[PDB]
Amino acid sequence: GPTSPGPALTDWARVREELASTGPPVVAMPVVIKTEGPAWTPLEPKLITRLADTVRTKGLRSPITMAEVEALMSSPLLPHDVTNLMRVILGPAPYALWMDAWGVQLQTVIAAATRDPRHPANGQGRGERTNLNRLKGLADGMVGNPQGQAALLRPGELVAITASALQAFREVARLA
Amino acid sequence: GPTSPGPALTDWARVREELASTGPPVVAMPVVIKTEGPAWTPLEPKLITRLADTVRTKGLRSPITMAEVEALMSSPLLPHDVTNLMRVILGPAPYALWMDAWGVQLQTVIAAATRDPRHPANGQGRGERTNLNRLKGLADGMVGNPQGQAALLRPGELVAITASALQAFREVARLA
């Protein structure tokens, strides 16, 4: 990633390499993790407003709306984002239905998550297994912390999260 | 912060404003958090190598080293950073002493943290109180996750963390 201009996170990979190519005594021994690649995608305000507009005018049960939401929810999103996105398009009343539907959808994910310790929502470690709270961005450190969510949620969970969001949306757009 | 070029985190502040300046029905009602301002500072590889060089040549008990480390540890750092910084300058053997000394130093912080629920290391909430593991970047989600640390640690904790690191360093540079 962009490390030439400025390193948001100390680029310890470079430090490693340096120390190495200079003297053997001790050396390139700093712990080089390299957690990289943001699997979530941020939404563009203007694209969100036009979705609101479309949901306003064309309706909600409208195929246009479904089409435009579907597309916008093809990329992984953080719990914070789905939540806010929905709070804006759905409105106070249906948002609740969605919240409910979304939780149900998420629950079946906690199954394929349990059924298989190899599910994309889980990690390598033994504790690294998703949970309803994680998926909802309610897990400790995620609550009201999108920055926190971006750092803790695994790509596999983001995909689950977003698909569920999209399902529950259809569930509510039609069954309403 | 930079939101004109591209919004790393969905800029919901803008979305709020839009919806508002257009139609009253529902409106600018997305939850706008705005967690901002990184209180930690990333280290520049070259500056780290020269510190290694200085620690190598000039020594460790050297005042030059103390001078150059002091300066470099005047800005808040993440547990990951202090740890790696030290692992590089201190070497296998003393690093252990430092680890030990650093923990002791951190422990007295857990006191002023407990003594006062208004300590900078604590938050507003009732659970938002620091702990040895947080300060060490061992808290869940911080382990091997500098990105995670940057999102969870509070500025007040970063200052504690870095000062302690600096103390424990002096503790080890002299008492060795």
Out of B7, B18, B152, the one facing A42 most closely (by C-beta) is: B7
Spatial CB neighbours of B29, under 8 Å, sequence gap ≥ 6: A87, A88, B16, B19
Q: Give just the sign of the alpha carbon dihedral A155, B158, B176, B100.
A: negative
- Please say whether the beta carbons of B61 and B176 come within 8 A: yes
Query: What gap in Å lies between CA B31 and CA A84, rounded to an integer?
Result: 6
Single-letter amino acid, residue A90 = L
Please state the φ and ψ torsions of residue B155, each to the nearest 5 degrees: -50, -45
Q: Give me B79's structure tokens.
A: 């547990």
* A173 closest CA partner among A58, A75, A76, A40: A58
User: Which H/E stretch holds residue A22?
Assistant: none
Structure token digits, residue A19: 């120390």
Question: What is the number of other CB atoms lying within 10 angstroms of the CB of residue B27?
Answer: 15
Q: Which of B159, B88, B164 is nearest to A32 (CA)?
A: B88
- Cβ of B146 within 8 Å of Cβ of A35? The answer is yes
Provide the domain count of chain A. Answer: 1
Pick from B4, B77, B1: nearest CA to B36: B1
Angstrom distance (rounded) from CA B170 to CA B156: 21
Method: X-ray
Cα A158 to the center of its chain, rounded Å:
4
CA atoms of B92 and B20, how far apart (whole Å): 59
Domain with residue B22: its CATH number is 1.10.375.10
Rounded to the nearest angstrom, the minimum Cα separation between A108 and chain B is: 25
Q: What are the DSSP E strand ranges found in chain B?
A: none
State the Cα–Cα distance between residues A86 and A44, nearest whole angstrom: 15
Q: Which domain holds residue A163?
A: 1-176
In this structure, the dihedral spanned by the alpha carbons of residues B86, B91, B97 and B100, taken in order and rounded to 10 degrees, is: 40
In chain B, residues with a C-beta closer than 8 Å to the C-beta of A30 are 84-85, 87-88
Are B19 and A49 within 8 A, CB to CB?
yes
Q: Are B44 and A7 in contact (CB under 8 A)?
A: yes
Q: What resolution does the deposited structure have, in angstroms? A: 2.6
Which positions in chain B touch A144 (Cβ < 8 Å)? Answer: 31, 33, 35
